[PDB]
Amino acid sequence: MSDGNVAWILASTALVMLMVPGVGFFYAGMVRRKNAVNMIALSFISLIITVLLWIFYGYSVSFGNDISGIIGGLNYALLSGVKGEDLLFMMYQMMFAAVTIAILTSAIAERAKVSSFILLSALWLTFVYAPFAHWLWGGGWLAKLGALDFAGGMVVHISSGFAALAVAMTIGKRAGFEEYSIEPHSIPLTLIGAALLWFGWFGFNGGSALAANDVAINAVVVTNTSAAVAGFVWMVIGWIKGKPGSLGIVSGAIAGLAAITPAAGFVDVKGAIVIGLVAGIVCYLAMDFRIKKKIDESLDAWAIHGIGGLWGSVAVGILANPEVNGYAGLLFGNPQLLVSQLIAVASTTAYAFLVTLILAKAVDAAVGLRVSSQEEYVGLDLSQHEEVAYT
Amino acid sequence: MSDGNVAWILASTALVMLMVPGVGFFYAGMVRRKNAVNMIALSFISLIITVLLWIFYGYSVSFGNDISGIIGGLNYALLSGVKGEDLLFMMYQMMFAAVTIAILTSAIAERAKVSSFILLSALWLTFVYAPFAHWLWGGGWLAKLGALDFAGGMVVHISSGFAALAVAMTIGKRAGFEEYSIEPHSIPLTLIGAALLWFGWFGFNGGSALAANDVAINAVVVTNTSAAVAGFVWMVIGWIKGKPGSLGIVSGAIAGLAAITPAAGFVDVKGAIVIGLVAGIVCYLAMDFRIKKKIDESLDAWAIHGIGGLWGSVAVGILANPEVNGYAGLLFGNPQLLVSQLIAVASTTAYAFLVTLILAKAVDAAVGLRVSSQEEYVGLDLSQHEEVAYT
Amino acid sequence: MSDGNVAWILASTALVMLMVPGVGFFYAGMVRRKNAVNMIALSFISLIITVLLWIFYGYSVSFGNDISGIIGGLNYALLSGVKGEDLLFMMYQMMFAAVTIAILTSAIAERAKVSSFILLSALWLTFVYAPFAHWLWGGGWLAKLGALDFAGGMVVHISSGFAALAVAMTIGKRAGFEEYSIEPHSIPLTLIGAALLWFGWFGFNGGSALAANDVAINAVVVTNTSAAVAGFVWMVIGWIKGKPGSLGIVSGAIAGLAAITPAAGFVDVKGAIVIGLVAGIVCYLAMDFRIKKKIDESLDAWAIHGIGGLWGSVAVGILANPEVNGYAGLLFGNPQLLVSQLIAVASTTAYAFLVTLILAKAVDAAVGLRVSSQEEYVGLDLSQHEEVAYT
């Protein structure tokens, strides 16, 4: 099977798995001390829950026999009939789902019942993630329309980003969100998370070529390029508005990483530079706007991943370079690829937001998403885990 | 030599090396602030000491010319006559030894002299680890009886687990262990360690196939499966007894990882599910029991690794699937494989505990294992390292 | 292109990238709480700035058309004409530059303007790093004289080490540096950085063979060997002078890693043992000496990397083993290789120090390197980033 290709994907799988707790640390540092354990714990639970549902039926529903082009069958339930390289693909994809669910916890920071999060996550993975993966990567209707998504601009970033906006609107603002600002309890912990996310993204984008080839190498080059450019943009914006906070710098880098994800294997370094530059700008504007609208989409999964994934996914249809990986976008003579991307971006953006809204409200009505006021006050570490982060 | 296979093992080696300080962080977060540096430092010392002894003679004593089937000769001392792929195997195995020694520090948490730990570790590596590795992986008597151990269920987990129980009983309870409970100074630091251990285990179990092949891929699938199931079990037990603490969740995942280690390359996903489920249950019962017996085996190396490695090693003889890697267990028609495992588990469990007990007491008599009461009071960071963790 | 070789280098690239924030954490734990974010932020900025300059022209100036043997042309600007494996080489080398710049931040700990650091870094990368890389690795004059540098003993360690000494002397001592000692705010954070640096060094030295072969395997064996020996030396020195602090242990390991870097692919285990042992000793003496001279080269980039890289680079000419990788040093009959190393070490050491001194003073005159006294007092987290590390 080419030991080298299996070697690279085995490693890329480990790298993406690390990104799950990586998201947890990234977010934990931005919430209050009394919620530090909860924020981290949520990412580990996201991993555990995803592994189980994925092998049980999540993998099958995503990449199984296509039915009407919107979802897969159950022929791969419990991995029945999944062997050889399919098992490695299954494993690799499993981690994309896990990271997606973790990114989503941004919207429930500091005020959700763990049990309700588990319920909603299982429903979301089933009715939003699996479908998306199938549409684009499982021979679904979007792939048929000619839409592309190299590493998850829509499957992972738009889905979690817009799903996060809907959840934030359903669960409500944290107490004191509008009156007083919430200070990050540990920026260093967040920076450790940021380091693990940049590192693991080598496997996220670089492993999506499913081989140690020229496409993987290109994906690694443009991924670092877009991250650097977008991170630089936020640094400049920071100086323009005051001082360059470290949170802004890494948030900018992640915007660049999310935007380049859908295009990593189709664009050149110059295209990567444009994607990162625009990503840095549009994502910053999105953050300021949701803040102005007073929406407590806490850790900006929407502004960074949602908007970052949206731009990047559209950018594919504009900048795809034929000399890089065969596909050509608008600027390279093919207006058709741009239309496929817009259809894909429009579909996934609307479904993610609207279906998540339905799922959130449903769970809220069935069991209640938010913790009591007193638990929010004492913190979820004590309330939901009976633990104290630091002594 | 197949660049792909060397690529995967070179990477798996780096991954296992990371697990050494990973254990240090995992444990450091569970002890008091005044002992944080000591707990971490012990894992780095474990690495440094292991590298030196291994190249000097540890590697040879483990995989050198067999003498009577219980130990290897000195033909590989100072790596004399070790080249090519043997050097990569030597390097990879070196890290398993290091992680094993680090896991063991669980038993001396907060009250051991660093010098004595170094002395005991060198003796243990020599008279317990090297022998075990040789018996099972160096063509020793256990391998001859037909016993199997894919990634270290006995060599690494039973050995450190039961060695930890003996050391805990020899060194004694921490001051105030029985009167008052010791609070973890930093659960987030422990969660960072847990993230690094799960990540590195991709190289631990996945690299034991010694190639980027279908066995490695299978090992990676079942390893994540068992971890998820056992982690889920502890989460449920947590809710049943109160709230799901994050420590319980990751401790459960590690139980699953330790239990699947001896079987990662021989069982299927369904077998992995049973191993993880039982691992979660038996390891939790073991923790409650050693606690009830008031044994201060501090960070539960015994309950998690000892008992987890024991079950998993026996499970190999029950669930090994011929279609996975040729070997068949009791449930697949071969009762012979189960008997080989029981003999191997019975031998390694008794030797680890009894020989470690002799070694611990010997070192205790020769130099004294435990620090003075005043040093235990002020903490080992100041007392043994003249350092203060946080300012 | 051999999927296995691309696999190993793709992974080695991710590993070296992780070392950049790794340096940040390593250093952050050693400075005061009020400067924790600044120290970490500097490493992320080092990464972002390096990625941009490298693709823009840094890569070309280092490995482009040679002009007079001292620098490369601009034929590779914006990666023009860089494809296939050259892109992977470009990516891999990019990270060496980033780590080098991060190591350098040792000299400006707690008192530099971020803007000035960015300016100086861009100038340094242009006039010191690019030249060095070209001289030794880009077919420059030093490579022509027969000088060798396997993974960066001179390109990365001597350059940052001596550049750090010059910068420290230009920017001046931190307030209270001579009167009172600065306590590390978080040794555990530093130990997390040390763990990431040891881990990533598998890709640093092991990936420099540019293939998953016997040279990579050898590099990995001797790299861990030298680290262990030098780390052991500092532990012993620690006990001789009091107690073995964890900072001393990991600082010793890093000295061993820096010293073995230039020789990783040319020496045997016995040579690695000598290099690590001497590295441990000479680097400790260098630290004590710069301290005695009251030079506030804060986090000892000079004593560890500068002196460690110098010894190691010279050691190559003494211990290179023909049976390992063809090259032979003085002890193996070839006095010629030693002379090439001394010329290379003498040139890079003098240029790094003198040119950096010119660059530092120039930037200081143009914009001012040091922050105001009040900003140094309140801390750079607030002053330069308007952030507070912990709440």
XYZ file of C-alpha atoms in Angstrom, chain C residues 176-331:
156
model
C 17.773 44.903 39.287
C 19.660 42.189 37.392
C 22.842 42.787 39.372
C 21.249 43.698 42.704
C 18.606 40.957 42.935
C 18.057 37.661 41.096
C 14.996 37.147 38.868
C 12.915 34.097 39.890
C 11.273 31.808 37.315
C 7.513 32.326 37.567
C 6.695 28.796 36.385
C 9.265 26.025 36.244
C 6.537 23.584 35.049
C 5.825 25.810 32.022
C 9.557 25.745 31.277
C 9.611 21.945 31.651
C 6.730 21.693 29.156
C 8.887 23.721 26.764
C 11.866 21.455 27.433
C 9.741 18.372 26.661
C 8.629 19.865 23.332
C 12.211 20.786 22.415
C 13.575 17.301 23.100
C 10.641 15.770 21.183
C 10.956 18.111 18.200
C 14.714 17.590 18.022
C 13.892 14.115 16.643
C 12.834 15.986 13.520
C 15.602 18.599 13.815
C 18.559 16.167 13.739
C 16.809 13.058 12.430
C 15.255 14.872 9.493
C 18.527 16.498 8.373
C 19.499 13.284 6.564
C 16.618 14.287 4.279
C 15.528 10.652 4.136
C 14.336 7.836 6.391
C 17.638 5.976 6.205
C 20.563 4.712 8.293
C 21.940 8.263 8.696
C 18.622 9.474 10.157
C 18.537 6.453 12.480
C 22.130 7.150 13.599
C 21.350 10.840 14.114
C 18.435 9.879 16.375
C 20.607 7.496 18.425
C 23.486 9.922 19.061
C 21.161 12.885 19.585
C 19.438 11.159 22.522
C 22.812 9.901 23.740
C 24.485 13.321 23.899
C 21.376 14.852 25.498
C 21.352 12.198 28.228
C 25.062 12.505 28.961
C 25.114 16.332 29.128
C 21.901 16.324 31.173
C 23.544 13.844 33.526
C 26.642 16.053 33.793
C 24.595 19.064 34.902
C 22.720 16.871 37.388
C 26.032 15.817 38.961
C 27.334 19.388 38.959
C 24.063 20.332 40.619
C 24.570 17.828 43.436
C 28.182 18.901 43.793
C 27.082 22.500 44.247
C 23.940 21.716 46.216
C 20.824 20.051 44.838
C 19.912 18.987 41.275
C 17.482 21.660 40.145
C 15.224 20.628 37.253
C 16.266 23.753 35.318
C 19.880 22.633 35.439
C 19.000 19.116 34.294
C 17.079 20.225 31.178
C 19.555 23.035 30.457
C 22.247 20.346 30.455
C 20.235 18.137 28.105
C 19.790 21.045 25.693
C 23.552 21.701 25.773
C 24.042 18.098 24.717
C 21.416 18.439 21.993
C 23.003 21.622 20.611
C 26.509 20.123 20.665
C 25.464 16.917 18.874
C 23.443 18.793 16.206
C 26.450 19.562 13.966
C 27.701 15.985 14.300
C 24.537 13.854 14.578
C 25.045 12.196 11.190
C 28.823 11.692 11.262
C 29.759 10.267 14.681
C 29.157 6.975 16.496
C 27.638 6.378 19.970
C 31.063 6.577 21.612
C 31.746 9.905 19.889
C 28.290 11.087 20.962
C 29.190 10.200 24.546
C 32.364 12.342 24.416
C 30.522 15.253 22.750
C 27.769 15.190 25.368
C 30.183 14.885 28.288
C 32.377 17.794 27.150
C 29.286 19.795 26.141
C 27.886 19.426 29.636
C 31.140 20.677 31.159
C 32.063 23.544 28.805
C 28.512 24.892 28.676
C 28.246 24.953 32.449
C 31.573 26.823 32.692
C 30.367 29.319 30.058
C 27.197 30.058 32.040
C 29.174 30.648 35.249
C 31.586 32.873 33.353
C 29.090 35.183 31.646
C 27.386 35.449 35.035
C 30.713 36.355 36.673
C 31.182 38.951 33.942
C 27.736 40.245 34.864
C 26.478 40.079 31.275
C 22.689 39.830 31.305
C 22.460 37.347 28.437
C 19.331 36.361 30.319
C 18.326 32.818 29.367
C 21.794 31.567 28.406
C 21.339 31.169 24.655
C 25.032 31.963 24.428
C 26.368 29.541 27.069
C 24.136 26.669 25.911
C 23.647 27.143 22.158
C 26.633 29.351 21.344
C 29.265 27.378 23.243
C 27.427 24.088 22.749
C 27.283 24.630 18.996
C 30.921 25.730 18.881
C 32.282 22.633 20.646
C 30.074 20.294 18.666
C 31.072 21.855 15.344
C 34.759 21.443 16.197
C 34.161 17.944 17.578
C 32.928 16.919 14.104
C 36.457 17.435 12.779
C 37.846 15.294 15.594
C 35.360 12.421 15.895
C 33.729 11.987 12.470
C 33.685 8.222 11.854
C 34.180 7.016 8.223
C 32.152 3.910 8.967
C 29.204 6.046 10.021
C 28.847 8.439 7.094
C 32.033 8.383 5.030
C 33.637 11.440 6.639
C 36.638 11.025 8.936
C 38.004 13.343 11.570
C 41.401 13.766 13.218
C 41.023 10.637 15.349
